């Protein structure tokens, strides 16, 4: 079975470099032409390069032209992509695929990608490792529908993705609903978690949100507590 895996950089500063590898398995590499294909997030597939079976020649996409380099080691069984001069447009997931043909693409014939493989992400950004300012989003007294309450944590202004927001050292589940991040103008992200709980419960229990932003190494615990407004929630149980 054809097994294609890439293994290459993630976040870099615009003007820096990466080197994507891609090792193959299941087939005789040195017989097939290989492609590199990227895909910026929520856009289509974009082709980046092709290299012949024997690497005698190799083509690039206008964009990538002259910055990027498709290299191939028929020996170790690996396809490379040397990305110099990384621009913020370079962002996205980089795939390596196989040309199912006779090892080039021409005016006679071009099979194109038959098997692809997984993808490895790269983010070029002018934007540096910033730790989450976690501000607790506190529950109101204002009575919603009768669908009880919902309280949360705003995990604001970080970099890069991802962040890990568990509830009550992870005792608390599936009330929980942590949204996808917005990528803000800043070049910095923000997520939110909302644990939707019975209005009843609000004030008997101790909801504490445990946020973890590995790349800053930022472990922040935050109590999410009701407004002194709520007497019906804040006052002692009569």
């Amino acid at each position: 079975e054809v097994q294609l895996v890439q293994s290459g950089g993630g976040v870099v500063q615009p003007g820096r470099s990466l080197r994507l590898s891609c090792s193959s398995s299941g087939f005789i590499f040195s017989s097939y032409a290989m492609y590199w294909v990227r895909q910026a997030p929520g856009k289509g597939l974009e082709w980046v390069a092709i290299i012949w079976d024997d690497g005698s020649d190799q083509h690039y996409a206008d964009s990538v032209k002259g910055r990027f380099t498709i290299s191939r080691n028929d020996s170790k069984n690996t396809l490379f992509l040397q990305m110099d001069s990384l621009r913020p447009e370079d962002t996205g997931v980089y795939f390596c695929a196989r040309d199912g043909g006779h090892g080039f693409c021409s005016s006679a014939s071009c099979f194109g990608p038959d098997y692809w493989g997984q993808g490895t992400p790269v983010t070029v950004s002018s934007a540096s490792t910033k730790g989450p300012s976690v501000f607790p989003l506190a529950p109101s007294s204002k009575s919603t529908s009768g669908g009880t309450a919902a309280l949360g944590c705003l995990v604001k202004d970080y970099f890069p993705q991802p962040v890990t927001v568990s509830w009550n050292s992870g005792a608390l589940t599936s009330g929980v609903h942590t949204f996808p991040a917005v990528l803000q103008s800043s070049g910095l992200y923000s997520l939110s978690s909302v644990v939707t709980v019975p209005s009843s419960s609000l004030g008997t229990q101790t909801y504490i949100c445990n946020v973890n932003h590995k790349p800053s190494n930022t472990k922040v615990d935050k109590r999410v507590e009701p407004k002194s407004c709520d007497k019906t929630h804040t006052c002692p149980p009569c």
Partner: protein, 216 residues
């Protein structure tokens, strides 16, 4: 030159004959063959049909292709619900000497009931106000179809400012989710009597109204 224009969407009730065209040029599809790829968004694609018309064995007999000169088409003849993926066409442009990919088509299967947004709106956190900032957060849950419009108002008036809304995603609630983050001054925020996140989904608009003096 990435002229392989495909129509961005394709609808269809279960069982019907849904085609996706893709018009290119003489220099790519006019020259070389077209292939069809199937991508579940962001994620590892797959060879759905090659050399104009042919299937990889393992592709269901229900899919067929066809060139015609300077353009070419994919037809799904038995539209199952699994057919909801992205469809890319592609062809080696002998002029540029490049593999030119399509602009993509997202096939939507028309049976599922309109689920309404479950809008829940939070004010700026008092701590966040101590750090000299004001972030209103609007959250939009369990909706379908995945097309929402979020609009921000204050008192009676539209707000366009610091309004950073996410695009609708995919929870495997099998329905869609979104957010929108209004960004104020602590000073702006208390200037008004009431902020509202109204969000309009298939004619219906749903508000959620918040006010600076809760307690008071």
């Amino acid at each position: 030159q990435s002229v392989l224009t495909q129509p961005p969407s394709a609808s269809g009730t279960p069982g019907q004959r849904v085609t996706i065209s893709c018009s290119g040029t003489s220099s790519n599809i006019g020259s070389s063959t077209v292939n069809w790829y199937q991508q579940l968004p962001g994620m590892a694609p797959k060879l759905l049909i090659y050399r104009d018309a042919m299937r990889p064995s393992g592709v269901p007999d229900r899919f067929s292709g066809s060139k015609s000169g300077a353009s070419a088409s994919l037809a799904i003849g038995g539209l199952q619900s699994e057919d909801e993926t992205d469809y890319y066409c592609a062809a080696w442009d002998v002029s540029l000497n490049a593999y030119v990919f399509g602009t993509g088509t997202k096939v939507t299967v028309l049976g599922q009931p309109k689920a309404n947004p479950t809008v829940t709106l939070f004010p700026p956190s008092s701590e966040e106000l101590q750090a000299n900032k004001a972030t209103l957060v609007c959250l939009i849950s369990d909706f379908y179809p995945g097309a929402v419009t979020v609009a921000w108002k204050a008192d009676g008036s539209p707000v366009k400012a610091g309004v950073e809304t996410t695009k609708p995603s995919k929870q495997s609630n099998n329905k869609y989710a979104a957010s929108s983050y209004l960004s104020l001054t602590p000073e702006q925020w208390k200037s008004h009597r009431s902020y509202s996140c109204q969000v309009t989904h298939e004619g219906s608009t749903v508000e959620k109204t918040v006010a600076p003096t809760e307690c008071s």
